[PDB]
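Limitations
The structure tokens in this dataset are predictions for the assembled complex, not deposited experimental models. Users should treat interface geometry with appropriate caution, especially where small molecules or nucleic acid strands are included. An illustrative entry is reproduced here so readers can see what is and is not provided.
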Amino acid sequence: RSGVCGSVWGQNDIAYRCRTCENDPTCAICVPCFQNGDHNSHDYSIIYTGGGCCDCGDETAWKPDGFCSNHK
Amino acid sequence: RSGVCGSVWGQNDIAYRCRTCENDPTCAICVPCFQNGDHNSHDYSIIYTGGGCCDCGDETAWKPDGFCSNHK
Ligand SMILES: [Zn+2]
Ligand SMILES: [Zn+2]
Ligand SMILES: [Zn+2]
Ligand SMILES: [Zn+2]
Ligand SMILES: [Zn+2]
Ligand SMILES: [Zn+2]
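Predicted assembly:
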């Protein structure tokens, strides 16, 4: 598909998985969204998803505690 | 989030909306997926979504009759 962050990354591009904040293992947020949130204690990792759309601000894909400062 | 087409486009990039195949107005497929499908009769439009992920092959976002030849 096409406030929620509209950022996107490509096949070779990195993003962040956070197992604490994710609704399911396919969820992920862009680097700026991760850096503007607080995951210090969380089980996070840099990934190459092979592309995707950022789930920051999407209550159905990400826990609101894990939203960055700019998306809710 | 990050079978289904994994293609992506950015803020300035075009994609296709197809009102016949879409599950909702936010759904969209990349240009190659549109060209490798059959939408001749359909109510389609070229859009600038401000970025997104291709819904081709996702049955929750796109009608399977509208899948391109390469995603089931
Ligand atoms: Zn983001
Ligand atoms: Zn964010
Ligand atoms: Zn987190
Ligand atoms: Zn169509
Ligand atoms: Zn596609
Ligand atoms: Zn396709």
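Some entries come with short summary sentences. For this one: The pocket of zinc ion (ligand 2) is lined by residues A 5, 33, 56-57, 67-68, 70-71 (CB under 6 Å).
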